[PDB]
Amino acid sequence: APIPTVEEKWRLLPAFLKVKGLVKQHIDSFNYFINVEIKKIMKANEKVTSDADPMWYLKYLNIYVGLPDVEESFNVTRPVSPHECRLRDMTYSAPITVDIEYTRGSQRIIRNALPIGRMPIMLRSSNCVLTGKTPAEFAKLNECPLDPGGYFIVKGVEKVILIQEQLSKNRIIVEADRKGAVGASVTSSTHEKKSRTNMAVKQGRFYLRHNTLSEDIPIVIIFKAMGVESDQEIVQMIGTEEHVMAAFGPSLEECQKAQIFTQMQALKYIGNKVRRQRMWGGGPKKTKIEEARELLASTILTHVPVKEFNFRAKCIYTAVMVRRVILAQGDNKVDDRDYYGNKRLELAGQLLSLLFEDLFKKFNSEMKKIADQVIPKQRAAQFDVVKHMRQDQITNGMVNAISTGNWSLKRFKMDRQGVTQVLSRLSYISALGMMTRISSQFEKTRKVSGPRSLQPSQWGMLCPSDTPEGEACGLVKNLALMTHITTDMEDGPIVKLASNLGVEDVNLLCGEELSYPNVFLVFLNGNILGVIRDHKKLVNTFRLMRRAGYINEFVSISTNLTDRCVYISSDGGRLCRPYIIVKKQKPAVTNKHMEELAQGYRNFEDFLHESLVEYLDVNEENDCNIALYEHTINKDTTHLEIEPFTLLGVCAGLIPYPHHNQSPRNTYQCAMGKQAMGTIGYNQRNRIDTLMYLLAYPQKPMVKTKTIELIEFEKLPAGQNATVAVMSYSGYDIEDALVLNKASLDRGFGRCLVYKNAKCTLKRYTNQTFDKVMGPMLDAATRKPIWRHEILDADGICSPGEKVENKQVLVNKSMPTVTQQPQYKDVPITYKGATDSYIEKVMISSNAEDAFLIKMLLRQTRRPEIGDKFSSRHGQKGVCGLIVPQEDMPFCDSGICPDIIMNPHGFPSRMTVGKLIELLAGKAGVLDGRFHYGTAFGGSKVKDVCEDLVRHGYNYLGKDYVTSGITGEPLEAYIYFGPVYYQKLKHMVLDKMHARARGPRAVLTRQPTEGRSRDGGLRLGEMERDCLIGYGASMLLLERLMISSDAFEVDVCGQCGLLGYSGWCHYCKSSCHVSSLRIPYACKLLFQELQSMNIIPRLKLSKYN
Amino acid sequence: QPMIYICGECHTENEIKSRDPIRCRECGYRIMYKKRTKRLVVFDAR
Amino acid sequence: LILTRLLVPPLCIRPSVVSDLKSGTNEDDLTMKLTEIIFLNDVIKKHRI
Amino acid sequence: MIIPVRCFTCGKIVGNKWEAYLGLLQAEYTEGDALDALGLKRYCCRRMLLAHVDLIEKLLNYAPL
Amino acid sequence: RCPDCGSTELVEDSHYSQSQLVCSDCGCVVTEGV
RNA sequence: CUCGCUUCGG
């Protein structure tokens, strides 16, 4: 009697994606920031006034961001589409306006709409013009309907703010030190101050360490300073277990050795151990005891609040910390940092909130300083802020922070880099997967261990396979398909319910109750909410209330039985995942519910409200029992997995039968497919990017995952299905190489288009002179333009439709040299390129600064050749090793000759059975005209496709009788034929091929330049020199490192040992002893640098004999 | 000499001479492409 | 061991780039450090006077 | 972008069988029987027509016009 | 002027990323390298 | 051009 199974359960996943999922994270965060958070920030800084001349003030009333507009029109705005901002290399922003009231001459003057800044507007956000638009309207706006959005456009480039990952704040962390001592640390961070305070056990006794104290001080002294003076009360708070007293005894003895027995004595000791903050201006009576008390009340343990100098809660918190340290000092239950229950994700909204708070505070400070400088000295012409409210402050700050990606917040002492990245437009999958990336707080700057590892906590939250192959392996991660990031809650009703649920106040009882076996501490965002007995009832009631709806569904409650702590988390940034609630071995979701969902009676929110599906946090799912499938459900199951294949991410969703492959193959395929060549969007023709790759005839895959259907990948395919035959042929496919069919390439297979951009600017300078373009310089001999100016039109700009060759001018730009007649020097925009290119379009625009922007879209049509990289959607990246004629290819009885011959030897080492199953399924599907599914942990089974193949008259395993094309005789072994979805990669031999003549050299050290773009030469690294030394080839090493790179001839004086010039020594004022000498130029630079450093190298020359 | 351009939404032939602010009649749109050349171009079917 | 004269290096060690696109030049750190040192020498002489 | 004129592997003319194929889809025909009626015996031409996406009209929606 | 043949047909022709002022008559490389 | 930063490739 198998348990009934809800087959349509997977239909819950699309409905969720109707409201949340892939891209809605950034969009929701930005909408919350621009609709709620900015008003909160302004309310926090609503009134600004100067100390000089009281009764003068500037009061903010309301703030608006409006719709995106362009300031091109003279003092006039105009609605602008995002594509227009892309083309004109401008920013897609909206005017930050505010209404204010202030006092000019003690008379209140109010403005109802006064611009102060510009917000770069995230695409598809609430204020973005693209929102709520139909595909026809998208076409009218020249935007692809399938574009994920969620990215900013600044100065014409698309920047994406990556989701930051960081450790949660205000949490006790017990960890071992370098010396093995098990200490504690808590980074108490409030809205104003972040301070990490530590507890050490360096000598068997506990010291508290803080940045504001000269030396770490015993914990008992701090306890005495915080109000509790009796040692017995301290010991009761620490714990009543015998080993706890045995461990804590030395601290008591150390305290008793000193004469500290009152609060005043401990405060005096701390004040002695206090350090002045660089002579803090203003002295309130030789402060010391007051300084110590203020540090205890405010600086130390900021997140723990003291009502009115009542340190009872802080005493309980530090006692709990001491108890945890003591308990962890025995059994090595050291907490791990990589556990994602302690991790938080910052989206674009929180970062933009911090940046706008900093910028607004700077703006208000500047306004106050201007008021102080102007008001008390000027005139009866009363100073008013409107004449001084510079509007470029906020706009420039936002633009620079988003564009450069480096964020410097002095108010928070936060120096972040690489926050924003250029959106990659290699393919639709590239942009979609980059849209869901997560960066780590630690960087590939060093070989760390642990974060780089795949922790089990990533289940359902982050994609296990998708990670960049290389130095950043494991430090850049991708969100799973079905995941959600929580926002902040009000935190009020949680406290109210917890108080009403029997949680005793901590102040009402002494610390001894903390040591009882049945007493459980209840926390709330790192603050001790209280104590409770019978925590099962409390947890069940809290979960029931959350299901009922009286508590926000993202509030998490978890239990730690080892520490006996009930954690209630309500802060934002936590990862959550929906799960079907299971009550007594039967899921809450039935077939009727899914039928209603399919018919449209109910949506996902209806499932949420009816206690059928609930969000689980990582900490909460630590305590739950989850069943992958219905048949796995047992008596002790609290939740059911909605769909296992949601475990994989977006890129990993492209893999057909990914569960049949080895994980490194899946990771390689994720990386490869991020770089797959294919269509970008429906507006890919009007779009002008710096580099674009298109496929001539893209085809949707024959074996498509449900993830492909969900993300509509089949609408924008990035590959072609080729009749692959798996066999060894001609020995030209030895290591990962593959053989291509010449006829297939002649018929358009793999045909690709490469679009490059060439942009020029004609700017007007400070002097009233401007860059101008000459017409083509006609040759008087032939009355035709010279070969260099052949392609230019009458206006000096190359016309679309013609072909450009190497060293030909596209724009005949000439610019003035003055900044009396103007003098123009020619700086034409030549086309550097190995092959010919065709101009597809020329775009001419004008900015507000009268700068003429010209963009040429050069197009090249490339055919696959030797060296072109090819992938097979399974991590089997390969290089086209040989292109054989069609007749040489083996053929089946039906006459089918394969396009791609791939070597069998790649399979056994990599065990990519998924590729074989995909080939079989694709063959069956194309035979019966169906699209088989290679969904993770599911999909079409082998038996069904085998039955389809035998029904259609082919072999039930794909292996087919094959006649050799060369000899005309049948092959001894059957050949594995079938359609495989091969995708071409952007790595081409034409772009990568490099050759270097003498070429240019660097000015500082006269050696060839670095890169191919700069015509640089290759580099003989240190190991190459080591290998040459090991060979013993002295002459070749000398020729390579001296003759061919930086050979030079200097003049050395044999008397003084210094370098002369032109056969003359200035130091000796003579020319008799000057001799020429061959030397590397870098050595001469080193000698001159050493001479400048007063380290004089004197060369004692001698004859070569 | 008539230099002719095509705006991005009107798609109308606009004749503008040098040093003119880029605009279009019966619109206000400011992306102004250039028309295709009249010279013959030879292509290879390969 | 105590320096009273500084050997300012030749121009080859300190290349200067004339970025005519703007009203400025790209100079390495050595030139700016030497400028600051000469400015300090002048300031000290002025203060002594 | 547009339907290729020739089949990649065999080389049978498949460009002229696209729009008529759509007619069979505008009719009641399934994919397999429509492909059979079009005369595509070997599976390579069936893959050519079945896996092709018609992006030309979507791109033309963004054409200047 | 060309130092070899004395002609004034000095053309600035870069050959594979090598800037080069060369006589257009006798091909004498007047100046090279930037 | 110099410099840094990112993303790649291997």
Ligand SMILES: Nc1ncnc2c1ncn2[C@@H]1O[C@H](COP(=O)(O)OP(=O)(O)OP(=O)(O)O)C[C@H]1O
């Ligand atoms: N950081 C690096 N340093 C030196 N060589 C590298 C580096 N990254 C890649 N390579 C080159 O690539 C080669 C690594 O391939 P290897 O690790 O042996 O196979 P693989 O990448 O595991 O492929 P499979 O996943 O086994 O299919 C060897 C090395 O010459």
Ligand SMILES: [Zn+2]
């Ligand atoms: Zn000398």
Ligand SMILES: [Zn+2]
């Ligand atoms: Zn127009």
Ligand SMILES: [Zn+2]
């Ligand atoms: Zn065919």
